[PDB]
């Protein structure tokens, strides 16, 4: 399926998402280091054999229940700085991003 960029990243807590806006991209001027998330990109996973343990998992947690993996942009280790500019580009036909 299609890869979506969302702020809500499963398995990752609120603290890491502090420096991400409602669109999932770091604020301009945010000071980052180590491995903080810069953009939150989610990769979907294929599942079509619907099993009861997955039903219990889907019932207790969200509709995704963290089925989809996350592959987000993180600062490579040993690099620090302050975000200067973000240059998001979009395809024709796709809905415009918030930023």
């Amino acid at each position: 399926g299609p890869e979506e960029i969302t702020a809500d990243i499963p398995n990752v807590g609120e603290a890491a998402l502090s420096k991400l806006d409602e669109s999932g991209i770091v604020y301009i001027g945010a000071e980052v280091t180590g491995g903080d998330i810069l953009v939150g990109k989610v990769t979907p996973k294929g599942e079509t054999q619907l099993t009861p343990e997955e039903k219990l998992l889907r019932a207790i947690f969200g509709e995704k229940a963290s089925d989809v993996k996350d592959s987000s942009l993180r600062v490579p280790n040993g690099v620090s700085g302050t975000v200067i500019d973000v240059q998001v580009f979009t395809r024709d036909g796709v809905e415009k991003d918030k930023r």
Binding site: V39, G81, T82, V83
Partner: protein, 50 residues
């Protein structure tokens, strides 16, 4: 065709001078720094400017 969205993020960091750094004049004389001496330890002239 494959890509639907591109995001580019810029980072800026200010590197300050430190012992390992390499410094050179324009007459072929190069070197690496060895120590960052305090102000009061450097030689000074009769006017006190180090």
């Amino acid at each position: 065709p494959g890509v639907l969205k591109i995001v580019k993020v810029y980072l800026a960091v200010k590197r300050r001078i430190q012992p390992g750094d390499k410094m050179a004049g324009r007459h072929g004389n190069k070197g690496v720094i060895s120590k960052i001496n305090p102000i009061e330890d450097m030689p000074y002239d009769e006017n006190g400017t180090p």
